[PDB]
Design a protein around this ligand. Sequence first.
Ligand SMILES: Nc1ncnc2c1ncn2[C@@H]1O[C@H](COP(=O)(O)OP(=O)(O)OC[C@H]2O[C@@H](O)[C@H](O)[C@@H]2O)[C@@H](O)[C@H]1O
Ligand SMILES: Nc1ncnc2c1ncn2[C@@H]1O[C@H](COP(=O)(O)OP(=O)(O)OC[C@H]2O[C@@H](O)[C@H](O)[C@@H]2O)[C@@H](O)[C@H]1O
Ligand SMILES: [Mg+2]
Ligand SMILES: [Mg+2]
Ligand SMILES: [Mg+2]
Ligand SMILES: [Mg+2]
Lengths: 179, 174
Amino acid sequence: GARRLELGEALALGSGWRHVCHALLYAPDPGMLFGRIPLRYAILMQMRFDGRLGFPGGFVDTQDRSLEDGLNRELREELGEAAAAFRVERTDYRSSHVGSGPRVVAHFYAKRLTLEELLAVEAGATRAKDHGLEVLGLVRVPLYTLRDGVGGLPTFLENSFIGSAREQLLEALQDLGLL
Amino acid sequence: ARRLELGEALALGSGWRHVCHALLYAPDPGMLFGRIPLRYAILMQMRFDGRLGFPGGFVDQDRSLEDGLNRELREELGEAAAAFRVERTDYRSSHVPRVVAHFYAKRLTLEELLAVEAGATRAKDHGLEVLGLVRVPLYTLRDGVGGLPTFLENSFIGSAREQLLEALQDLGLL
Ligand SMILES: Nc1ncnc2c1ncn2[C@@H]1O[C@H](COP(=O)(O)OP(=O)(O)OC[C@H]2O[C@@H](O)[C@H](O)[C@@H]2O)[C@@H](O)[C@H]1O
Ligand SMILES: Nc1ncnc2c1ncn2[C@@H]1O[C@H](COP(=O)(O)OP(=O)(O)OC[C@H]2O[C@@H](O)[C@H](O)[C@@H]2O)[C@@H](O)[C@H]1O
Ligand SMILES: [Mg+2]
Ligand SMILES: [Mg+2]
Ligand SMILES: [Mg+2]
Ligand SMILES: [Mg+2]
């Protein structure tokens, strides 16, 4: 796996390093697939332009005052105006990893929404600036395993993921709920 | 999966069930990064089981394959799917539980396709049977792997990957 960095460590890296920020947006979901399988949470990912599943967010530049401003800017471009109903903050920060690209550090955040907030993000996503360009569409992460022992989560994890998105996902699944 | 003619597939026992699915596509003059022609917007969807597939479902009280296909498309995609009708002339192939999988490709305008994406979260199956729609990237990036080739490494239901690839070449979407 990619090297874990401390946040402070990462921010003290030279001007040549680029920082990228992504967020896992999630909300409790009381629904039940087929009326019997608890969904537990609605968690959003997206199909990226490169054919991989990822988390919304993107590069932070010099014109971004903080990691969190860059992140929220990128979420707005990628998810649309309903993203503005909330702010992902330093309290939502979970991890930093050395990126595979030359001198990239990947910061990961997890942000609890209400189901109504998450729903509004989904409903407006096709109006996002990057819908149909960087973002090919949003998908929810299935948290259940189906009665055949493979359908659902284990099969979702078999898709292609960008960077550390798979690891970032699994760690949040453990950390957060008993998912 | 075993290929068969439609007339062939239509003569089978009630033991046999029929499923229909559609690839909705529209020309897209856009360019990713202002540089990469997108060519077509093609819809696929992430299913409850964590696999990519095409919208559609089991034919059942359905007068024909087509009635069954559009009935299911509306349930999965929502009201904007009622703006058009997938017909026998959009038929592509049939493939053989004892289920036979019929595959259709239906051309829309970009605006009709966009309306489908825009209303899909409202659909009956959204958040349950369907986890969200995605477009199929048709370009290959400069690294020779990003885009379609990586897309095709994802998990697919049934014959979806093969039905995709046959449509991409036969309708000359590449
Ligand atoms: N979850 C992740 N974990 C680790 N690394 C990641 C993750 N997600 C992305 N990366 C890395 O960071 C890079 C940038 O992430 P994006 O989300 O794609 O950034 P964004 O600013 O939204 O746009 C990417 C830009 O890169 C150019 O290739 C292209 O012009 C595009 O505009 C990716 O190419 C990838 O290597
Ligand atoms: N593109 C495809 N090619 C071949 N087979 C397919 C394809 N898509 C689906 N199938 C198969 O057809 C069957 C059902 O397809 P769905 O699209 O899921 O049909 P729908 O009517 O929406 O089904 C309701 C769902 O309830 C679940 O209990 C059950 O697993 C079924 O998928 C499954 O056996 C699935 O493997
Ligand atoms: Mg971006
Ligand atoms: Mg991005
Ligand atoms: Mg269905
Ligand atoms: Mg279906």
